[PDB]
Amino acid sequence: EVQLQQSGPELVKPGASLKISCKTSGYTFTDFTFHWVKLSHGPSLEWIGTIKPSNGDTAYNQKFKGKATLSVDKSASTAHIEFRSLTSEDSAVYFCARFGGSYPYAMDYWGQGTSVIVSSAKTTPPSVYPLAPNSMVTLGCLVKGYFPEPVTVTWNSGSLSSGVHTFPAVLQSDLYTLSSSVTVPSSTWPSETVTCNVAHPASSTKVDKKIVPR
Amino acid sequence: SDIVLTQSPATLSVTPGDRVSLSCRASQGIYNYVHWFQQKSHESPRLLIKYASQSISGIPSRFSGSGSGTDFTLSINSVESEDFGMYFCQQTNKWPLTFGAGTKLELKRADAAPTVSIFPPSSEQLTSGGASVVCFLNNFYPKDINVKWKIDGSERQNGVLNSWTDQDSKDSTYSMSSTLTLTKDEYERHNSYTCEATHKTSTSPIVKSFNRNE
């Protein structure tokens, strides 16, 4: 089976250079052009450029001229994209794709994506704050000041799964904030305890925060 | 000029079993050189149709494409639960290769005003010298919404962190979290903390507030 395997998530500093890889298996690497695509918030897809592995011919989107450089390593059937002078604008998920299949070709096989986060941050555990205040009551947990992603949240160790909203984390001033809400009947709180469990594997953190009335 | 692909409407709301058509319009004639992709979360784009109408091995028969020149259409002949997500068109007739901005295929439901809850800073955060005020704007539909923070009746935009959920897998609604962060010193210089939610469900914003000194 045709497989495009990309290198792992990257946590890089502003101004750095980074090279990310797209390693193929199951077919002849030099058969088809490779393409790189940037997935940014929206979601939004942008085409960066293409390289013809058989001869090194390229075509670039002018928007990425200088920023991104394409290459191939035929000895290892691996396509590479190199970024220079990284900024927060370059934080995105990058995909490689081949332009093959039955004739006429199209972007038929894709890599799994490579997440790139450009930040000056160091691994930092989260602070977990309680969110305490109808027929229903909403409680929550505010997860701030941590790095990197991911942080995962459960309520009562997964026993409270209905009426939960866990929001995507957002990076602001080189630290993340995440929040999670839970809605329970007003009659059940504070009599039935509500606790968020916050896991941050990067910092070896797993903490509980019980929500109590103000 | 780069070929501009316009996908309009940006959001199509349907129910499983409906027949749907998605539009991709080109700024200049591109013959049959349009391809369609499905895209979910941060996963790889998936090729559905190539060269406006050509089928792809393994793609279910319910997906078809038609059109030529500048007017293209992707059709789903009876929408299945697995089909909700983003649909992007792409042109390969001219350099640089370009994508449309995407159409979100979402689950249709009845409009719902957000359930708004506001929370003062926790004593734990205050002890650390910080003050975050959180508003959850939960289970609303449709997705567009605006939040404004007012401190002592004055709009505040500094220190606001917003996050939005994808469409809820259980009830087809959307949620939003908004966190306003101040220092403890700045938080104590004011009394009223308000978050105003503007949504299509009412001509009046939902106004949730608290007074610090209460």
Binding site: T33, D57, A59, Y103, P104 | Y33, K94, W95, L97
Partner: peptide, 9 residues
């Protein structure tokens, strides 16, 4: 058809 030389041939 400026992209065929690169993409298809």
């Amino acid at each position: 058809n400026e992209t065929d030389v690169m993409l298809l041939n």
